[PDB]
Amino acid sequence: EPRKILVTSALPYANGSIHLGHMLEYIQTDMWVRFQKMRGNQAVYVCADDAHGSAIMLRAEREGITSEQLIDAVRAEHMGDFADFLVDFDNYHSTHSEENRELSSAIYLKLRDAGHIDTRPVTQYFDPEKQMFLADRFATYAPTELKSAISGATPVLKESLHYFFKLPDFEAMLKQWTRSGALQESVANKLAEWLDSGLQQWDISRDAPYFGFEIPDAPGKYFYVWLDAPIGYMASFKNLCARRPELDFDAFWGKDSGAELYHFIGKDIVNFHALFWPAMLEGAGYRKPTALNVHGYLTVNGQKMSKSRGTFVKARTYLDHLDPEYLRYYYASKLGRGVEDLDLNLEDFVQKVNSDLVGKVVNIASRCAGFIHKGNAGVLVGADPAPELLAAFREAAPGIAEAYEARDFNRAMREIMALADRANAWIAEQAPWALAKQEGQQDKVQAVCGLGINLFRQLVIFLKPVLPKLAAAAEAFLNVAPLTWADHQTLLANHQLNPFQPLMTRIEPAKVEAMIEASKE
Numbered sequence: 001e002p003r004k005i006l007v008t009s010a011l012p013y014a015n016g017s018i019h020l021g022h023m024l025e026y027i028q029t030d031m032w033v034r035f036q037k038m039r040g041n042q043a044v045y046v047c048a049d050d051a052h053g054s055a056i057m058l059r060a061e062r063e064g065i066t067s068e069q070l071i072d073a074v075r076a077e078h079m080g081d082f083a084d085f086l087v088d089f090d091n092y093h094s095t096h097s098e099e100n101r102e103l104s105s106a107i108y109l110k111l112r113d114a115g116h117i118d119t120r121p122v123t124q125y126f127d128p129e130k131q132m133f134l135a136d137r138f139a140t141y142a143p144t145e146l147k148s149a150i151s152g153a154t155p156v157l158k159e160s161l162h163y164f165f166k167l168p169d170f171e172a173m174l175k176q177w178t179r180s181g182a183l184q185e186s187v188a189n190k191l192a193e194w195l196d197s198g199l200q201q202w203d204i205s206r207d208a209p210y211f212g213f214e215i216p217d218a219p220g221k222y223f224y225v226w227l228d229a230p231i232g233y234m235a236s237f238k239n240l241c242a243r244r245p246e247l248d249f250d251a252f253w254g255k256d257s258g259a260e261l262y263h264f265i266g267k268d269i270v271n272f273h274a275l276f277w278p279a280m281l282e283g284a285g286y287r288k289p290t291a292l293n294v295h296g297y298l299t300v301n302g303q304k305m306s307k308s309r310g311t312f313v314k315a316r317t318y319l320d321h322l323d324p325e326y327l328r329y330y331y332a333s334k335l336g337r338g339v340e341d342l343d344l345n346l347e348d349f350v351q352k353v354n355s356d357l358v359g360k361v362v363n364i365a366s367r368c369a370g371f372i373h374k375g376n377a378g379v380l381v382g383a384d385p386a387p388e389l390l391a392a393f394r395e396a397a398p399g400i401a402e403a404y405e406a407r408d409f410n411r412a413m414r415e416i417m418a419l420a421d422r423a424n425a426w427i428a429e430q431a432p433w434a435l436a437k438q439e440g441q442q443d444k445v446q447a448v449c450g451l452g453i454n455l456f457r458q459l460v461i462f463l464k465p466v467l468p469k470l471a472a473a474a475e476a477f478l479n480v481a482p483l484t485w486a487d488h489q490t491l492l493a494n495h496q497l498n499p500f501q502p503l504m505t506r507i508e509p510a511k512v513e514a515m516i517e518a519s520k521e
């Protein structure tokens, strides 16, 4: 039977553009989702904009527009960037939605009646040296407007009631769940620092003015953005189930759920997804996630992204100059099971993509297709010129799937390009361009280029989750139904091809520099 898989990515904040560092997470997630879809599994990919908090109030104020105005414009822009980068969500919702308002309040109310909510007064005191108000830890709250000394009648001591999630109530459960396999060992041991220290109650309320959901029965008190943000996951899925009759909420979020749930996140936000989130789900009556998939961050030419050096590239700025599949492949070629950083070496970016994709994959196709087109009216002739070469492709497939399954895209691209390298070399060894000029060798020409195109179909199957647009164009040329992973098991013989679709041009280094220049501020 197929696997039911609900996959999410972190919800970007609704206060700025998506940049190429953010894009690494969504490309990682989308590629994994597309692979599971090819494998015949029910993989559902949901995300949303994170539209609350002082983060949004600051930008809304900085631009003289309302908070609703900003997040609406921003959600449109984020969805356009993701879509153009071929990141295909099943739903892209918003933490500022009626589903999130009800889910947050229903979860809160259940947790409260179970005794997992606490009320205590937080004190803030003015520090004359640091010249600002500090919180009573026993840091300051994030500012909501743009803005000190001890004034005569001005208080030096604020106080306000806050609402706490009694996270320590789940410490035993969390001590077990964090080491259950849901986290990679590196992740679990870095996270366990909070556990070694002892969990603390979590401040989930903010005072007015705050752009967010109001807390039931606490007038003037709002949920902190990080309280409702992960509930955006459930909200995004609940909103989707209204339009997808085959998707049942309880089937994915009930404690009994036999479905898998994965959160792709960056390493900076593990504590929210690994401590508060699974405690919240268990206390509220839902299943905990199957695993967190944690990733590192992006560097460009060996250094941190620089707005001054022009290596802090907006997704739209990339898309103005370059094919998105360039970057999708480059990321795939370095994305690993680990949690390390990933470097975009711009010179290596051009050499690697041109040599691997255009050179080893696209050119095997266009060269061979031309001979089938001109020499046999476009009918691919079936033959067995190089059985050992073909068997290698068969032997390699389940391993490439294992890499995909385990998020080891690096290994997967490696295995694929090794097959590409070997197939390409055999074609060159045959030299159909030379056989085509010899009289009485036309059968040989079609035998060779038939295998060539067959192997290109195999490479497209293997690369489809990285290059879904290229795959679509390839399926048009190959004149086949959309490719499943199981299609690798069959071959085209005696098959009418369509005209050759353009698949990918080389990366022009001028365009890469034009992208960097456009990003210098």
Ligand code: MET
Pocket: 009, 010, 011, 012, 013, 050, 229, 230, 231, 232, 269
């Ligand atoms: C529920 S995931 C929230 C992610 C958060 N908005 C961030 O950008 O770090």
